[PDB]
Amino acid sequence: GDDRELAILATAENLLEDRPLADISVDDLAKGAGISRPTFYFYFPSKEAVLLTLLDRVVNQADMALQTLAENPADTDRENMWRTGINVFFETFGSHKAVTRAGQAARATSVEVAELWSTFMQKWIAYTAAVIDAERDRGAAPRTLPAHELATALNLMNERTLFASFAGEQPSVPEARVLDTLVHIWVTSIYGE
Amino acid sequence: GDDRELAILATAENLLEDRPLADISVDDLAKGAGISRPTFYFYFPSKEAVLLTLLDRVVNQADMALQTLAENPADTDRENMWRTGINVFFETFGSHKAVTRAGQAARATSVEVAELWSTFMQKWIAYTAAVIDAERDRGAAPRTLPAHELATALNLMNERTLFASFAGEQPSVPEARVLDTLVHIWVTSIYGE
Numbered sequence: 001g002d003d004r005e006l007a008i009l010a011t012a013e014n015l016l017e018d019r020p021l022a023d024i025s026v027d028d029l030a031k032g033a034g035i036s037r038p039t040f041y042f043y044f045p046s047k048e049a050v051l052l053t054l055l056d057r058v059v060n061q062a063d064m065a066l067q068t069l070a071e072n073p074a075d076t077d078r079e080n081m082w083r084t085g086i087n088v089f090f091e092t093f094g095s096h097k098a099v100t101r102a103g104q105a106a107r108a109t110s111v112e113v114a115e116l117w118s119t120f121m122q123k124w125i126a127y128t129a130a131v132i133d134a135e136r137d138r139g140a141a142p143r144t145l146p147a148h149e150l151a152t153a154l155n156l157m158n159e160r161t162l163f164a165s166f167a168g169e170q171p172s173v174p175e176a177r178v179l180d181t182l183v184h185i186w187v188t189s190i191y192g193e
Numbered sequence: 194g195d196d197r198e199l200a201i202l203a204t205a206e207n208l209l210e211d212r213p214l215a216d217i218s219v220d221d222l223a224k225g226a227g228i229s230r231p232t233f234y235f236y237f238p239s240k241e242a243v244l245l246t247l248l249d250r251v252v253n254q255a256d257m258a259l260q261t262l263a264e265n266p267a268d269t270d271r272e273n274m275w276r277t278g279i280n281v282f283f284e285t286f287g288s289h290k291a292v293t294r295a296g297q298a299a300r301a302t303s304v305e306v307a308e309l310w311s312t313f314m315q316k317w318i319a320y321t322a323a324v325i326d327a328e329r330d331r332g333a334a335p336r337t338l339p340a341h342e343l344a345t346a347l348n349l350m351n352e353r354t355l356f357a358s359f360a361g362e363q364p365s366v367p368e369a370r371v372l373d374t375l376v377h378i379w380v381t382s383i384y385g386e
């Protein structure tokens with residue numbers, strides 16, 4: 001029961017490694033999960049709902065990890081504290097590249113996918129802007145741009161740059177260099193006069 | 194002749210203001226240009242080729258503007274020199290928002306669209322990295338990250354952040370604030386130790 005659901009999600013994630021959602025049928029997902037077509041419909045209304053569930057699981061994983069770090073500050077310097085947050089994405093989405101690719105292709109057409117990602121980005125941009133505000137109040141950062149506008153651009157940069165790196169787009173920063181590249185831009189733009 | 198072609202392109206750009214390419218038919222484009230369906234096919238093979246032509250015109254406009262500025266340096270400070278380049282996009286794509294929205298939705302599915310944009314981004318990232326290298330050789334900037342990796346992330350940031358601002362995505366930096374936000378991040382990350 002919870003078994004068949006997990007097998008349907010595992011099948012979709014496996015299949016999305018080789019082709020887009022448009023080339024996967026409900027019959028392919030059911031066949032991979034060892035169930036019939038109408039049994040599939042008991043668990044999901046459509047192959048699009050399977051993708052949404054996979055995206056919801058990955059986004060909550062990242063969010064829970066970031067909550068853990070926000071509750072458990074590392075005894076390290078400021079550059080390494082920003083690095084630890086960025087690395088959540090690097091590690092969580094970078095462990096589910098096919099799902100990430102499929103979430104981005106769906107965003108153009110799917111209101112549900114676009115809304116799910118927006119809700120989460122609003123949260124992480126708010127947390128970012130709150131940290132920057134805290135750092136300015138402590139005298140560690142200068143009051144330059146509005147913190148919430150700076151946080152919005154830096155989080156958008158990381159969304160698009162990690163995507164390109166994970167995809168091997170041309171142009172992209174190589175995946176083994178992208179964390180240091182992003183952390184440089186965050187620390188200079190937040191602490192730089 | 195050149196007339197009917199320009200009317201077909203003007204029709205598509207007008208229609209794309211109200212709906213996506215998927216909801217526009219060849220018959221809608223021909224009807225708007227005052228021609229029949231088979232006459233349309235004399236000028237374009239498909240509605241997708243009309244979109245590609247509109248994107249090619251906008252991308253070349255921006256590229257020609259950037260070439261003009263690269264040949265004609267402004268007597269101003271360094272922050273304003275980066276601002277003038279960024280503002281090419283702000284102004285050129287921001288004057289053709291519907292075409293820009295449609296180019297981005299097509300990118301997921303269209304190899305031609307994705308390749309056209311890549312060629313141009315490779316050029317502008319190379320120019321950026323060349324400027325940063327020049328500035329380091331003159332002692333104006335510190336040698337921190339590899340210039341070509343820094344240039345790649347900053348140009349990707351501007352692609353995604355200008356897109357969001359032009360679209361009124363939630364989250365996005367407001368269009369009246371996005372140039373100052375981007376120029377801050379470029380100047381601190383390029384000149385900041």
Ligand SMILES: O=C(NCC1CCN(c2ccccn2)CC1)N1CCCC1
Nearest residue numbers: 066069070085086089124128155158159
């Ligand atoms: O890399 C990020 N965001 C990084 C920020 C960094 C600051 N944040 C932290 C930092 C340390 C701990 C918890 N959150 C929120 C996430 N993104 C957001 C969209 C996809 C890529």
Ligand SMILES: O=C(NCC1CCN(c2ccccn2)CC1)N1CCCC1
Nearest residue numbers: 055059089093100103104116117162163
């Ligand atoms: O491209 C993104 N983020 C945006 C897309 C948006 C569509 N996707 C969604 C949407 C809602 C929930 C989870 N993923 C995949 C991620 N990233 C995050 C880190 C790696 C590159």
Ligand SMILES: O=C(NCC1CCN(c2ccccn2)CC1)N1CCCC1
Nearest residue numbers: 259262263278279282317321348351352
């Ligand atoms: O805003 C930029 N890029 C800005 C750079 C800035 C440096 N460049 C300049 C600067 C002054 C003159 C000519 N080119 C190339 C463009 N992008 C590239 C993708 C879409 C948005």
Ligand SMILES: O=C(NCC1CCN(c2ccccn2)CC1)N1CCCC1
Nearest residue numbers: 248252282286293296297309310355356
């Ligand atoms: O989103 C983009 N750039 C990427 C898209 C890629 C798809 N589009 C193309 C593709 C090839 C040529 C021109 N436009 C629209 C622009 N921008 C540029 C400045 C404003 C926001």
